[PDB]
Write a protein that binds this ligand. Structure first.
Ligand SMILES: CCCCCCCCCCCCCCCCCC(=O)OC[C@H](COP(=O)(O)O[C@@H]1[C@H](O)[C@H](O)[C@@H](O)[C@H](O)[C@H]1O)OC(=O)CCCCCCCCCCCCCCCCC
Ligand SMILES: CCCCCCCC/C=C/CCCCCCCC(=O)O[C@@H](COC(=O)CCCCCCCCCCCCCCC)COP(=O)([O-])OCC[N+](C)(C)C
Ligand SMILES: CCCCCCCC/C=C\CCCCCCCC(=O)O[C@@H](COC(=O)CCCCCCCCCCCCCCC)COP(=O)([O-])OCC[N+](C)(C)C
Ligand SMILES: CCCCCCCC/C=C\CCCCCCCC(=O)O[C@@H](COC(=O)CCCCCCCCCCCCCCC)COP(=O)([O-])OCC[N+](C)(C)C
Ligand SMILES: CCCCCCCC/C=C\CCCCCCCC(=O)O[C@@H](COC(=O)CCCCCCCCCCCCCCC)COP(=O)([O-])OCC[N+](C)(C)C
Ligand SMILES: CCCCCCCC/C=C\CCCCCCCC(=O)O[C@@H](COC(=O)CCCCCCCCCCCCCCC)COP(=O)([O-])OCC[N+](C)(C)C
Ligand SMILES: CCCCCCCC/C=C\CCCCCCCC(=O)O[C@@H](COC(=O)CCCCCCCCCCCCCCC)COP(=O)([O-])OCC[N+](C)(C)C
Ligand SMILES: CCCCCCCC/C=C\CCCCCCCC(=O)O[C@@H](COC(=O)CCCCCCCCCCCCCCC)COP(=O)([O-])OCC[N+](C)(C)C
Ligand SMILES: CCCCCCCC/C=C\CCCCCCCC(=O)O[C@@H](COC(=O)CCCCCCCCCCCCCCC)COP(=O)([O-])OCC[N+](C)(C)C
Ligand code: NA
Ligand code: NA
Lengths: 630, 82
């Protein structure tokens, strides 16, 4: 009834005490269950908390006083919305959110649910109707809301408690929800990184024997790998540099200290799921990320990852990479030198008549075995690393060009045995790509690799904008010139071709006297010359110059990711040739479990020195019984 | 170096002039300018009537104004226009 909720909104204490006398004469059972608002499930308690003020409504205790005399309180407090757009939002969700920490005490006391799952549509991921996703558990609402005194209350509250494992419809626990809510801002990063500690302290204080970060969701992604994948760099920086300094919350410390003599101290980062976990390692989830994951290129500046990939590189991958380079250098030499000495006389296939022709077909065999190689290796990139239609033609500009090289290189095999001379058109595009694809292997070299990152950005930022506009003018004046010519340069090729020469400094301003109006012709070329040679090629240099200023460190961070993707494909390739990925870290004891056992975490050393932390608060230091692992 | 953001702001104005000539051109082809905003109640007049101002939504999020001083908030009886 509208009159009932009217008195709830305007905190009318006497009217709700008058209706107290009304309903208690009746049975109340269906009576109030029919009075709640149609197709929304808005009972008197839910609506009382939306229309409260400054931490009170004066009806919220009263309606619970009515519900303890008149039975069926449990249906009232746990009454959630009915529509699929506010579904499951109990009175307790509104309690946490609107900051009245004293209110939510009464609800859990009065049989309110704390395992309430609010998956409507305002609590899912849709930019239409931009809902706020908090994790689908009130424990996670308080966590995402800067309510830490409340989350502490949710786990020491009376008889009914909140289950810290906050598995929901999507499977995201509270830590997952805290990754999904981040924004990589300073206020939010400063917040969420803190909250993990207290959730983790409490998870280790109130429910030991369950380390909370190994837990996953419906899609199967830890909060570590959910921060790696969703682009959360400050979150990821915390979880990797996590250094808890207190007993019985110390096994969860991620950055240990294996010793500290003076200023020098050997940090002992753990490689738990940075590399070689059964799914979704941080390096994979960053390296094998899609395209629009924010901060993707900065997420390897995070320690230990910058110094772990440089460890795998200097130790494992630098020797296999420079071998793969050499084998591709010689593949080009063998393929070049097999194409330079092709048979000009006749139609293919050709014969091994001379002695040299046996060596030539050999280089042709060895050429095709590498074409099917980069073919299959470009297939299984689309079966191992499944892309989407946007990430085919973006973020994977290499696996296409080595695969594209093979298309020409296998069409070359089709058109050789299909009895045509068109094998040359394909064999020659395989060479230009093939040598142009040597610029892949700059990514094992810092100064050449960054240079080749500064090549790709120009081709996509500056040539791409340039050459498009350039072809507007070119075809714009070309048509304008061949329109004027009468007659031989009366073609659109031989006039686009001659006007492209002004670009490369080979423009004759008198390439045709077969015009009919000279001033038209000369006005029309000098317009092309000024707008293209003097303006637009020099404008290009300017934009490159502004680009290079922008992409200076943004290209070094694309470089370390190019090298990173190389370090991981190298692991997957040599999984049985020599060994596994080598595990890139020493299994070392860091302390003791809370269950009273050794830990033995695969850890990566980082010798660090600091000339200001003179005190050297001992804290963690593990082999302080030793001094430097001797 | 000078005209980096001073050219993006000339660009949004080039696009702006295009958005408005497009309105004036198609004033009868399909519709008016489409009015680009939902007629919504924002409160009440000082003369004691509804307001119904043509308003444009902007979903905004701020991770420092934790208190959330209520002040204006209009459909606080609701939660998110449902
Ligand atoms: C009938 C056929 C018709 C054609 C259309 C069919 C499709 C065309 C092919 C698709 C592709 C079209 C490409 C157009 C030119 C641009 C190339 C370019 O930006 O590449 C950079 C690439 C980088 O590596 P990666 O991708 O691994 O790194 C990426 C990348 O950095 C990303 O930003 C990061 O997230 C992260 O680092 C990582 O995700 O570097 C190399 O791949 C090595 C160097 C490669 C050479 C670079 C120079 C450009 C040469 C182009 C011309 C080829 C040679 C002449 C041929 C003549 C005609 C046959
Ligand atoms: C990076 C990718 C490559 C780019 C290459 C760029 C290079 C430049 C553009 C290359 C592509 C387009 C070239 C024209 C198409 C072939 C027809 C032609 O040349 O002449 C046609 C004539 O008529 C004309 O020349 C005018 C008609 C143009 C219609 C096509 C639109 C092209 C759009 C894009 C244009 C740019 C707009 C801006 C684009 C953003 C007929 O063919 P013909 O044989 O020449 O005529 C002989 C006929 N006769 C014997 C009876 C007398
Ligand atoms: C290159 C330096 C850089 C360093 C890298 C070194 C790279 C390797 C170096 C050299 C390898 C080749 C040596 C043998 C051929 C020499 C004799 C010969 O035929 O000479 C002829 C040229 O050569 C040809 O006509 C053969 C075609 C080229 C061979 C391509 C490599 C084959 C794969 C196997 C290679 C090993 C891989 C497998 C190993 C396990 C002389 O020319 P012509 O006779 O005047 O005219 C051509 C003939 N025709 C007219 C009849 C058409
Ligand atoms: C054929 C019989 C053997 C005789 C050949 C004779 C040699 C003549 C050479 C080349 C001709 C050989 C065939 C061509 C193969 C195509 C090229 C290729 O595979 O490149 C791969 C090499 O990575 C490999 O794993 C190569 C496989 C081993 C080659 C063994 C022969 C090398 C001998 C000589 C060793 C000398 C050592 C000296 C040390 C001082 C490319 O690496 P990738 O990891 O795929 O990364 C790129 C692909 N991506 C961009 C898509 C990611
Ligand atoms: C991608 C997913 C996997 C692909 C499939 C997996 C395998 C891929 C690898 C290999 C399989 C082969 C693929 C290509 C086709 C072979 C050539 C051919 O059919 O030629 C035909 C003609 O051809 C010509 O007339 C021109 C030939 C030269 C073209 C040069 C560019 C090569 C492009 C390379 C492709 C780059 C494509 C770029 C992709 C974005 C021959 O057929 P025909 O009926 O006898 O025609 C005769 C006509 N004629 C007498 C007038 C001459
Ligand atoms: C090892 C390769 C054997 C290849 C043998 C074949 C011949 C030689 C081939 C190429 C020359 C390679 C020499 C490498 C050693 C130089 C010193 C150095 O380490 O780097 C230095 C110079 O860096 C360079 O010289 C890199 C140049 C290669 C770029 C590849 C693109 C085109 C290749 C086309 C090739 C045509 C092939 C056709 C003819 C055969 C720079 O130092 P850095 O490394 O940047 O510093 C640390 C980097 N880090 C942070 C990653 C740790
Ligand atoms: C005959 C007709 C053709 C004539 C010749 C054609 C010549 C070919 C050339 C240009 C064609 C015109 C497109 C100009 C694009 C401007 C540059 C750009 O967007 O670069 C981006 C592409 O980033 C990617 O990831 C996509 C890579 C492919 C190239 C983009 C253009 C092709 C797709 C579109 C459709 C093409 C339509 C083609 C015609 C149907 C990357 O650079 P950026 O975004 O500047 O980076 C700054 C970062 N910021 C944005 C955050 C500030
Ligand atoms: C940038 C904004 C875009 C503007 C677009 C529009 C611009 C278009 C501009 C002008 C349009 C008209 C020019 C062509 C005339 C038509 C042909 C004609 O009758 O020619 C006559 C000749 O005449 C001459 O020889 C003298 C030409 C005088 C104009 C020279 C400067 C114009 C460019 C100023 C640029 C400033 C731009 C603004 C910046 C300050 C007679 O015919 P004929 O057969 O040629 O006679 C023999 C000729 N012969 C002796 C040479 C052999
Ligand atoms: C933002 C948009 C881009 C700009 C678009 C607009 C740009 C428009 C561009 C150019 C416009 C100006 C040139 C017009 C073309 C010549 C037509 C003509 O009359 O030819 C006659 C010139 O007769 C003379 O007396 C010429 C004297 C001045 C020098 C000629 C120009 C130099 C070209 C370089 C200028 C570089 C500087 C460029 C600055 C413009 C030829 O007569 P003739 O039959 O051969 O008789 C021979 C003997 N006689 C010459 C003694 C008579
Ligand atoms: Na020149
Ligand atoms: Na020149």
């Amino acid at each position: 009834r509208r009159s009932i909720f009217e008195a709830v909104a305007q905190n009318n204490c006497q009217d709700l005490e008058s209706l107290l006398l009304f309903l208690q004469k009746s049975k109340k059972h269906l009576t109030d269950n029919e009075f709640k608002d149609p197709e929304t499930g808005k009972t008197c308690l839910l609506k009382a908390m939306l229309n409260l003020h400054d931490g009170q409504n004066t009806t919220i205790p009263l309606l619970l006083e009515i519900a303890r005399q008149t039975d069926s309180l449990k249906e009232l407090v746990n009454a959630s919305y009915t529509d699929s757009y506010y579904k499951g939002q109990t009175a307790l969700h509104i309690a946490i959110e609107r900051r009245n920490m004293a209110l939510v005490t009464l609800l859990v006391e009065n049989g309110a649910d704390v395992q309430a799952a609010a998956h409507g549509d305002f609590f899912k991921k849709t930019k239409g109707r931009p809902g706020f996703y908090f994790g689908e558990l009130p424990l996670s609402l308080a966590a995402c809301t800067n309510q830490l005194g409340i989350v502490k209350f949710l786990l020491q509250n009376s008889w009914q408690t909140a289950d810290i494992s906050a598995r929901d419809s999507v499977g995201n626990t509270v830590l997952h929800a805290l990754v999904e809510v981040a924004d990589n801002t300073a206020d939010n990063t400063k917040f969420v990184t803190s909250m993990y500690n207290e959730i983790l302290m409490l998870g280790a204080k109130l429910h030991p024997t369950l380390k909370l970060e190994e837990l996953t969701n419906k899609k199967g992604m830890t909060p570590l790998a959910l921060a790696a994948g969703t682009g959360k760099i400050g979150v990821l920086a915390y979880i990797l540099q996590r250094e808890i300094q207190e007993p019985e919350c110390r096994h969860l410390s991620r950055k240990f200290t294996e010793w500290a003599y003076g200023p020098v101290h050997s940090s002992l980062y753990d490689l738990s799921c940075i590399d070689t976990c059964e799914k979704n390692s941080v390096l994979e989830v960053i390296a094998y990320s899609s395209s629009e994951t924010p901060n993707r290129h900065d997420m390897l500046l995070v320690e230990p990852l910058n110094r772990l990939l440089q460890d795998k590189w200097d130790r494992f991958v630098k020797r296999i990479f420079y071998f793969n380079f050499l084998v591709y250098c010689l593949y080009m030499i063998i393929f070049t030198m097999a194409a330079y000495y092709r048979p000009v006389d006749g139609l293919p296939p050709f014969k091994m008549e001379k002695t040299g022709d046996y060596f030539r077909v050999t280089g042709e065999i060895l050429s095709v075995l590498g074409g099917v190689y980069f073919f299959f290796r470009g297939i299984q990139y689309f079966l191992q690393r499944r892309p989407s239609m946007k990430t085919l033609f973006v973020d994977s500009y290499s696996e296409m060009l080595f695969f594209l090289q093979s298309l020409f290189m296998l069409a070359t095999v089709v058109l050789y045995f299909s009895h045509l001379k068109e094998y040359v058109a394909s064999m020659v595009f395989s060479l230009a790509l093939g040598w142009t694809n040597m610029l892949y292997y700059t990514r094992g070299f810092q100064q050449m690799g960054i240079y080749a990152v500064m090549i790709e950005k120009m081709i996509l930022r500056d040539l791409c904008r340039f050459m498009f506009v350039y072809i507007v003018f070119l075809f714009g004046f070309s048509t304008a010139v061949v329109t004027l010519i009468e007659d031989s340069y009366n073609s659109l090729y031989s006039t686009c071709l001659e006007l492209f020469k002004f670009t490369i400094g080979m423009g004759d301003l008198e390439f045709t006297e077969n015009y009919d109006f000279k001033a038209v012709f000369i006005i029309l070329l000098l317009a092309y010359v000024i707008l293209t040679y003097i303006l637009l090629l020099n404008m290009l240099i300017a934009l490159m110059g502004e680009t290079v200023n922008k992409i200076a460190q943004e290209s070094k961070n694309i470089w370390k990711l190019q090298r990173a993707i190389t370090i991981l494909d190298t692991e997957k390739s040599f999984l049985k040739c020599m060994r596994k990925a080598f595990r890139s870290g020493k299994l070392l004891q860091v302390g003791y479990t809370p269950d009273g056992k050794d830990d033995y975490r695969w850890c990566f050393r980082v010798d660090e020195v600091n000339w200001t932390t003179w005190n050297t608060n001992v804290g963690i230091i593990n082999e302080d019984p030793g001094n430097c692992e001797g």
